[PDB]
């Protein structure tokens, strides 16, 4: 049952990202911006079977897209997601500038920005901790260099596309 | 059988040798292996680790595409390290083996061929590229390799 | 992730170069990736060597006459480059780099431009 | 087999002009292309690639468009690091890869 990761509503935030358990209808649409697989390819899944089959999906900006991938660097890569350099799997997406855009801007979705160490593969951190400082203490915004570990996106009906929401979702094969 | 024990030069497994003739071998404590399960000697050199494959029953890329005996084998395989001699300070690669290729050997089987393996979907018509591979690869031979990386010279009788 | 090379500065006009690059922070043990060579002589713009995969496979630049030979050491963990009886248009910079490798949805398989680049190395030819 | 022309060998301009570059191919290709930048003395980078796909961390004054055997390179409003030497290079399936003779900017 795709249809409930593929046509859902609401979605979750890329440092909260969302996992579920669990082809045709997948590959011969023409809806999807983004196509690609790694390790295997899509007209030869219905020849193979597996014992796991996990499902992830979250939203990001449009311009981060490319972050989604074995062996990147960035923000979102180093503190929000990570695949291994051995991943087995595809990479599902397109543009949602019809959803997700209010005027005024939405401010819902949140990223984490900050961290003190780089993630491990498929991992994710939830709890507001400590903020990210320089030799002084901080519990607030008291410190200069003092920061809030958090950040929201500005999505708004117009926009250049590189800034307009993208929903991605990525399926993960293992026997 | 000094000749074949004793020749200078061996040829390369893909291109095995053939030759036909109508007390040293066997005592002899040179040879690291000797295992005996119309007289037909071959030649040629393999890695170490790839001597077991030279068997009745073995799989592999050198019992797949390179050479391959019967079942019903009735013969001795003898096989020795000669590191010595066909090793290089700087590297040797002037041995090769075949390493792609549609189908499977059928025993004492030679294939001489060095046509373009087409991989993929796309066919080429016999221009190498990112989806059309040489089928041929070469060995690398140094004096500092493990034992199970340095050259070995075999020789299997058949009668 | 960050690459290294080693290498000689000097060479005779008539002996074997040898070059070494390699990786850390990660693995050569991947079919992901792949690995190239390029060179730049001084003044010039770039050339390209050839590819090496993952399991062995190798990809030669025709134009020239397969000179150059690329390996793994597993050993090691490293990739070289060999090349006997240099001469004097052989001084140039050195480059190892990394790529990637995906399957499209039609099914074909395509590939990525080069994206992680070494510090390069310089050769001189002596007499 | 494929080969490339660039043209102009050299440019010269100043502080917020527009810039545009030209990567002319002898047999189509399927956008299959990219564009290096190399500062003097050190590795080149990467800046677009599928002629039309911009990289993670470049500014965003760089564009390019293109498909088949023309491609052009635009920079909206030149800044102080923004001169230097750019090659274009393809990556086509059936046939061995090359780079471009690169061109060089100034001030002027």
């Known amino acids: 049952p795709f249809g409930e990761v593929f046509n859902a509503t609401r979605f979750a935030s890329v440092y909260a990202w969302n996992r579920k358990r669990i082809y045709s209808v997948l590959y011969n649409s023409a809806s999807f911006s983004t196509f690609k697989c790694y390790g295997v390819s899509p007209t030869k899944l219905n020849d193979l079977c597996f014992t796991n089959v996990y499902a992830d999906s979250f939203v990001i900006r449009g311009d981060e897209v490319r972050q989604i991938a074995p062996g990147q660097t960035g923000k979102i890569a180093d503190y929000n997601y990570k695949l291994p350099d051995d991943f087995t799997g595809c990479v599902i997406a397109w543009n949602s500038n019809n959803l997700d855009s209010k005027v005024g801007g939405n401010y819902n979705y949140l990223y984490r920005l900050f961290r003190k160490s780089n993630l491990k593969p498929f991992e994710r951190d939830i709890s507001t901790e400590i903020y990210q400082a320089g030799s002084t203490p901080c519990n607030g915004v008291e410190g200069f260099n003092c920061y809030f570990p958090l950040q929201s996106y500005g999505f708004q009906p117009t926009n250049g596309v590189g800034y307009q929401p993208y929903r991605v979702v990525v399926l993960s094969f293992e026997l | 059988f000094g000749e074949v024990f004793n020749a200078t030069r061996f040829a390369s497994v893909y291109a095995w040798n053939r030759k036909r003739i109508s007390s040293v071998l066997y005592n002899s404590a040179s040879f690291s292996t000797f295992k005996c399960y119309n007289v037909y000697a071959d030649s040629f050199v393999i890695r170490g680790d790839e001597v077991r494959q030279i068997a009745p029953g073995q799989t592999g890329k050198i019992a797949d595409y390179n050479y391959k005996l019967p079942d019903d084998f009735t013969g001795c395989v003898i096989a020795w390290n000669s590191n010595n001699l066909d090793s290089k300070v700087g590297g040797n690669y002037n041995y090769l083996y075949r390493l792609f290729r549609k189908s499977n050997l059928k025993p004492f089987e030679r294939d001489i061929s060095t046509e373009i393996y087409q991989a993929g979907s796309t066919p080429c018509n016999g221009v190498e590229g990112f989806n059309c591979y040489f089928p041929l690869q070469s060995y690398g031979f140094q004096p500092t390799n493990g034992v199970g990386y340095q050259p070995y010279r075999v020789v299997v009788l058949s009668f | 992730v960050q690459l290294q090379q080693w290498g000689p500065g000097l060479v005779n006009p008539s002996e074997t170069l040898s070059l070494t690059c390699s990786v850390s922070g990660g693995s050569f043990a991947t079919e992901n990736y792949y690995w190239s060579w390029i060179r730049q002589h001084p003044g010039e713009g770039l050339e390209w060597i050839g590819n090496?995969?993952?399991?062995?496979?190798?990809y030669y630049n025709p134009s020239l006459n397969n000179r150059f030979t690329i390996s793994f050491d597993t050993s090691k963990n490293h990739l070289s480059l060999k090349l006997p009886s240099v001469t004097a248009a052989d001084t140039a910079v050195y480059y190892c780099?990394?790529?990637?490798?995906?399957?499209?949805?039609?099914?074909?398989?395509?590939?990525?431009?080069?994206?992680?680049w070494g510090q390069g190395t310089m050769v001189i030819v002596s007499s | 087999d494929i080969q490339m022309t660039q043209s102009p060998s050299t440019l010269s301009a100043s502080v917020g002009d527009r810039v545009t570059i030209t990567c002319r191919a002898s047999q189509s290709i399927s956008s299959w292309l990219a564009w290096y930048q190399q500062k003097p003395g050190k590795a080149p980078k990467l800046l677009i690639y599928?002629?039309?796909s911009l990289e993670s961390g470049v500014p965003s004054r760089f564009s390019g468009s293109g498909s088949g055997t023309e491609f052009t390179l635009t920079i909206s409003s030149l800044q102080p690091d923004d001169f230097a030497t750019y090659y274009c290079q393809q990556y086509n399936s059936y046939s061995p890869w090359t780079f471009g003779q690169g061109t060089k900017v100034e001030i002027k």
């Open positions: 599928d002629a039309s």
């Open positions: 780099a990394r790529g990637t490798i995906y399957f499209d949805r039609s099914g074909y398989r395509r590939v990525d431009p080069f994206h992680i």
């Open positions: 090496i995969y993952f399991s062995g496979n190798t």
